């Protein structure tokens, strides 16, 4: 764990992917497109926006069905390399104070940059959006923690001493640094274990693929 409950609607680009229940997160990058992790693929997905407590109808939510789901063409289910996926919504959503988009990276954020990670974890009890402030770690530290498992399309975010980390339910969610989406919650060995910080898809390596895909679809 280690996170804290986010201030209500303070992360307006955060979405919940639901196929009967919440199973993954995602980010709204424009009024009709969401970015998430490829391992979050399901044939039928309902996107829920403007959420805080996913177990109660609060009044600010928008429920929209996914029209097209496009996984990165080179996604590897074993290594998790290229763990990224785009979802086009059935219809554009209404952008407001509680539902907004997040900017794609203008470049790759350097190690040491402080970021915000968010998501819901693992029927009437409150299930509130959680937040965690954590820095991007240097590649060498990431590699040392996961020998032979880190590719150039991944980045570690968190603490080598563990204690604070993203966990199950968080996959596909945003890692935002200086107002730009720099990572997507992907994997890790356990959660919050020392010497095994979370691994995230490095979004700056995919800006052109994202833009090219949205334009062609």
């Amino acid at each position: 764990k280690g996170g804290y409950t986010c201030q209500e609607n303070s992360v307006p680009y955060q979405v919940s992917l639901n196929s009967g229940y919440h199973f993954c997160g995602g980010s709204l990058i424009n009024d009709q497109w969401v970015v998430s992790a490829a391992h979050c693929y399901k044939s039928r997905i309902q996107v829920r926006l403007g959420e805080h407590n996913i177990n109660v109808l609060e009044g600010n939510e928008q429920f929209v069905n996914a029209a097209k789901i496009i996984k990165h063409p080179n996604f590897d289910r074993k290594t998790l390399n290229n763990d990224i996926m785009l979802i086009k919504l059935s219809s554009p959503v209404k952008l407001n104070a509680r539902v907004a988009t997040v900017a794609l990276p203008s470049s790759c954020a350097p190690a040491g940059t402080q970021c915000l990670i968010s998501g819901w974890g693992n029927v009437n009890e409150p299930d509130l959006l959680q937040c965690l402030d954590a820095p991007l770690l240097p590649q060498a530290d990431c590699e040392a923690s996961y020998p032979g498992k880190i590719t150039d399309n991944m980045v570690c975010v968190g603490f080598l001493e563990g204690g604070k980390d993203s966990c199950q339910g968080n996959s596909g969610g945003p890692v935002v640094c200086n107002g730009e989406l720099q990572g997507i919650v992907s994997w890790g060995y356990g959660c919050a274990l020392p010497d095994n910080p979370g691994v995230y898809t490095k979004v700056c390596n995919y800006v052109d693929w994202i833009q090219d895909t949205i334009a062609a679809n």
């Binding site: 229940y21 391992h39 199950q168």
Partner: protein
């Protein structure tokens, strides 16, 4: 029964929250567990029927 049916459920390294079934040797039946979305082991089923058929 097969050896993989006696292994504890495996969440895996991915961080999705997907409910799957696994055969619980001590209980004598299949129960649910949270699967992470990648690298599933064999004691992981999309339905109790399948789980009970394969590991019952």
């Amino acid at each position: 029964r097969p050896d993989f049916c006696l292994e504890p459920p495996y969440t895996g390294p991915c961080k999705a929250r997907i409910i799957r079934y696994f055969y619980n040797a001590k209980a004598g039946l299949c129960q649910t567990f949270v699967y992470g979305g990648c690298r599933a082991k064999r004691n992981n089923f999309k339905s109790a029927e399948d789980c009970m058929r394969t590991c019952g």
